[PDB]
């Protein structure tokens with residue numbers, strides 16, 4: 432430890448500079464200086480180590496200088512105090528800081544190593560050998576604290592590719608701990624995992640990062656979840672597929688909630704009926720971590736009467752309350768109708784050359800009739816949630832849409848196909864048998880507005896639904912088979928409907944003011960319904976194929 436050995440170490444290194452022209456002697460003096468320095472490594476002052484490293488650099492002794500720094504580092508902290516003080520988080524700042532002085536010198540050597548060899552080719556040159564020996568010392572070192580400080584240095588430089596090709600396990604430990612605190616380092620870890628074909632772990636990083644309290648925008652959190660769902664939908668080696676689908680499910684649920692929050696935040700900020708003093712606080716609370724469905728509903732979607740987003744929340748939350756779901760559909764239908772009606776009015780004023788109210792901006796292109804806009808809102812939710820949902824109870828929802836169409840005159844008086852409710856549900860994929868089942872119930876229970884002469888339209892709906900049904904049976908060539916199927920009950924319904932029609936004709940002929948004008952319409956509809964009943968009876972009286980529908 433004492434002074435003579437140190438002086439003789441410096442003496443050898445001095446003589447080495449004087450013998451640069453004699454390569455065997457230069458190499459021997461340098462090794463001897465290194466040997467003596469390592470003997471007194473625990474006692475070397477920062478200034479002595481610095482001068483020695485500088486002279487070693489001048490003589491191209493890169494690897495030996497680094498080995499000396501690493502030897503000094505361990506000897507001043509043989510208990511590995513800095514490692515434990517780091518794996519935790521104080522007077523052990525003595526052990527870590529003394530080590531870091533050695534580590535900073537190593538950075539110095541490596542910087543000069545690259546500068547002296549920049550623009551030279553990799554038998555290997557002596558420069559290639561010195562590079563190999565120097566980085567063998569660095570990378571084969573067991574000082575994992577040194578490696579942590581080294582990785583931090585590479586990152587501060589932007590030398591990203593050098594981090595990724597590290598074949599050591601210490602770099603995993605380093606990135607995993609700084610991913611919990613900084614968004615940047617978490618990305619390297621995922622880039623580290625995936626290139627090594629480890630997608631599930633990268634999905635776990637991205638997921639916990641999407642759930643973290645770091646500063647991440649909602650839209651960036653959606654990107655992380657979209658990524659994780661993908662990395663967690665394909666199994667990397669050696670993890671139970673029954674745990675893959677676990678992470679894939681979690682990322683999927685969060686992604687669903689996150690998109691509802693994103694659509695909710697986008698609408699609130701753009702809403703003219705929301706005051707600005709509220710919008711800043713809205714963006715502050717929604718553009719960040721993902722909220723609970725309960726909070727998104729009670730504090731935002733419900734208050735704002737965003738009935739479509741409420742229905743998406745009910746779907747995501749497995750909310751079991753058919754009454755609330757149906758009432759929310761009713762509010763969405765009526766809200767959408769009222770909005771579409773006002774845009775039509777303003778458009779019609781422009782077409783007629785009228786005057787708009789002050790400040791009103793009319794649609795520049797023809798806006799949809801109210802039932803078209805209503806249908807669009809229904810279809811948007813259907814394509815987003817699928818019909819396999821509790822927010823699509825056809826038995827309850829189809830009568831609500833049908834009642835809307837009658838009560839609001841969305842019929843041929845505005846140019847609409849009177850059967851648009853039925854075409855809507857059929858085009859969404861609702862099976863024909865279920866639609867006719869609902870329409871059978873509507874015809875038999877006679878609840879307003881499905882009363883009086885308006886039951887003519889209900890028969891029109893039945894005829895249309897059955898027409899499209901037999902056409903689809905003829906197209907497929909087979910009838911798939913208490914899920915309702917085509918049977919005698921359909922034929923009985925069509926027969927029954929004939930009595931409804933003659934009853935409606937009779938009350939029409941005697942209306943106060945003159946006979947109704949739909950006498951021939953009803954007569955033709957009677958013939959149409961009877962023709963459909965023949966087709967149904969022929970399909971049932973036949974033997975044609977009943978066919979397959981696998982799960």
Ligand code: NA
Pocket residue numbers: 702703704705
């Ligand atoms: Na508004």
